Each structure stands twice: as C-alpha cells, then as structure tokens.
Amino acid sequence: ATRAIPELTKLLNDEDQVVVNKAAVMVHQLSKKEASRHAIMRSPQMVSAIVRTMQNTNDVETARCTAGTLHNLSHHREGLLAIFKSGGIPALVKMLGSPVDSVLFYAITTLHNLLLHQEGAKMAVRLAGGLQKMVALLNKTNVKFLAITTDCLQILAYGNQESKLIILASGGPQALVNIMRTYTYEKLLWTTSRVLKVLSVCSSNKPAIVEAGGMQALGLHLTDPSQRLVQNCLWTLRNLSDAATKQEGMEGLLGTLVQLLGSDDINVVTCAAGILSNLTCNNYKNKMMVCQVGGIEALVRTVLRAGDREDITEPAICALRHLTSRHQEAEMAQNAVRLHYGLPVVVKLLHPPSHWPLIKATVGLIRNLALCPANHAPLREQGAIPRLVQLLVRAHQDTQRRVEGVRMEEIVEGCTGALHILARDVHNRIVIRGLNTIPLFVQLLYSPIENIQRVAAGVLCELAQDKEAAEAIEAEGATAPLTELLHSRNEGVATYAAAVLFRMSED
Ligand code: PRO
C-alpha cells in the first residue's frame, strides 16, 4: 500500500520500447485503487513521466494506460491540481489527434473534468489549440463521447468571443448542425443546442449557422418531451431568425411554431411569436405558409391571451402586420383578424400602458387591416381614428420642439399612413375632418422626410375628393407646398400632390 513507489517512475521515464510500456500497465493498476490513487499523485516526477510518455509513445496499450491513469486521477480536486501544475493540458489536447477510440475517450473526459473544476483550465486548453481539436472530433459517432465534447466547447465558448470565432473558422457550425439532425440522444442534443445558442449571438457565427441548415435542424426538436431541449432550440432559433429570410424548406418549422403559440409556457409563446415575426418579415412564401396553417387565428388568440405582456404582444402584432400585406392571401388574412375577434384588442393596444415599440407595430397592423373594405366600419366603431390622430398630434409636437428605441418621426408616418388608408371610406373622412386634422396634414407637407410627405399628400388626396374638404385644404394654403412637391424625387409624393391640386382647382 503506502511505501514502495518511485521505483515504477524510473522505468516509465526510460528511453526503451517494452521497458516504459509494461511499466505503464502498473501505475494504471495502482491508480484503479481509490485510496492508492489518493496518494499516487503527490510525486510531480511521477505525474510528469505519465504525461511525457503519453505525448511520445507508439503503443495502444501504453497510451490507453497513461490516459486512463490521468482519467482516474482527475477525480480528486488534488488530482486536478496535480495534472494542472504538471502540464497535462497540452499533452491531453495533443492526444485529441489519436485514432484510438478509448484514448480519445479518456482524454476528452479528463479535459472535461479540468474544464469543470480546475482553476485556470479554460485558458490553457484554448492556448493548446483544444478548440480546433475538439471541433474536428465532431464527426465521431459515439454519443456519450460527443456529449462530452460539445460540453467542453460550450464551456470554452461561453462569454468568449475569441473562442466563438475560432469555432467558426474550424467549421463548428456545420458540424454542430449535423449533430442536431442526426442524433436522438437528449443529453447530446441539449448540450449541442447550448453551443449553438452561445454561437447564435455572434454576428459571424449566425449566418454560418443559418447557411448550414440550422433553422431546419433546430426545427426537428421542437416537439421533444424535453422542455430544456425545446426551450434551447427556441432561443437559438430566435437569435438566428433575422438572418434566415432567404431559407427554404421552412414549412415544418413554420407549422410547429404556429402550434407552439397555443402553449401554456410563456417563454415558449414569446419565442414562437418572435421567430414567426422575423421569418415573416419580407419573405412572402413564409407569409403564405403561416396563413395556411391557421396562423392568423393563433396569433390573435395569443394577443388576446397575453393581455398586457408586451414581450408577447409586440412580436405577435409584428407578425400579424407581416401577414396582412403583400402576399397572395393578404386579403383573407385582413378579414380573418376581424373574423376571429381581433379588431377590438388591436385598437386597445394603441392605449396606455402600451410602450412605443408596441404602438408602432399596432399602428402598422391597423394600416394593413384598413386595406380591406369590410374593416373600415369596425375600425371606426372600435375607436381607431381619434387615437391615431392623438398619437399623430402628440408625436408631431415631439418632432418640432428639440425616445425609447423609436423616433417620433416613425409614429408620425405610421399614423398618417394608417389614416391615408382609412380615408378611403366616406364616413371615415367625415370623422377625420371633424377632428380638424387638415391643418396638421398640410404642415406635414413641409416635413424633411419623404415618406411623411407621401402619406400626408396621400391622405389629403383622399380628403380632397369631398368638395367641402377641398375648399378647407385650399384655405390652409396647401397650393404652395404641394407646388414644390410636384418636383419631388419620390414619385409617390409628386403624384398625390397633383391629384390634390387637381381636386382643388376645379373651380
Ligand atoms: O411580457 C412582458 O412581460 C412585458 C414586460 C413588461 C410589460 N410586459
């Protein structure tokens, strides 16, 4: 037991074929006895012999035993301290190039244990080039092994942009995604999805992950019984989804997201809405699919259930906004919001306690709902016009006398845009006129921002079809600024300005 020890060292530190080798197959034996190991690591000359012969050997039984020895040692916070003080990490790492399974296995786990409990280990693995070696090991097939490898990477990448970028350069994205769409073993899916989550916040990793088919691979696991796996997939998907606009094969993912809106889980709902919102920005096929599986229905139920939780309603309202314009079934989707009792909650969201990003999104949504003639009347009846006008008036004031991520100039355009559309209905024009908005619309012709000139001239154009309003618009002195705008680089502005002008001088 306790006494006869550094005999076995000398032999390992020897420079001969069988001599050091068969001497290895002994400390291995001795390391296996938990109280005999708890004493073996005390001699740094003994510790270091193990390391050396490991880095420089040729024997499959030799390596196995030296690794295993270190494996077995890495269980005591004294073993760890010893392996560290000795310099195991560069050798262990160097061992990640070996072709003998059981050696890889011992190396990875030892590094894993060091990475978990040993002060200073993360730095030394990076310095040894361990990230690159670990990425290259991702093509293996034993799941316990990949679990441990991906966890090493997670531990190294977390909070370390340098490590994230090296992972990128070694082809991590592709290799981690292949894992997500190949295996079923929860523990490994979960840790891989955590590496991907850590990489998904990096501006360079994100497109690389999206190009490897990340969105679809993460999509595959959204119905797993494991809640931690689903949630991690949801967060990664969300971080990535602004970069995923050009991706195809999105049908299954899109369908599951809609279902997930039904969920009792708040973070589930919040992510599915935020993902659907992003994946539906600009890409009209995505609009099509989400409408096809009942997305309008689901998004409305979600807005109704969220009440005043803006982490939910804001992205759900943004999604609804995307789904209600510029695609083959926009029109059906504009109707459907009304048919599922959406109109009263949408107008409500214009009122406190709603914060600006929500209000902007909601005004945008109302703009689009108004393109549908059968929404004219209920939007009016629900109170949309007076609030829109108040939001317009207040925001124009804030513009003149000089917020929370949104510029009042966008509220001005959004509200004037919505009123432009609402103004196609004759009763709406009466309400808009009664609110004495004409002076404000005329002032908005002088805006520096073209998009504001456009909606202002557009809405005046709608008002000017009624004789009384045409008279009013003239009495505001609209002729002069409309006259300069006939020459706008923006053809939207020029065209409306001539329609208003034409309706005024019919006298
Ligand atoms: O969804 C939520 O929880 C946000 C945060 C405060 C207001 N509503």
Ligand code: PRO
């Ligand atoms: O966000 C706010 O504080 C106010 C409430 C209504 C208009 N904007």
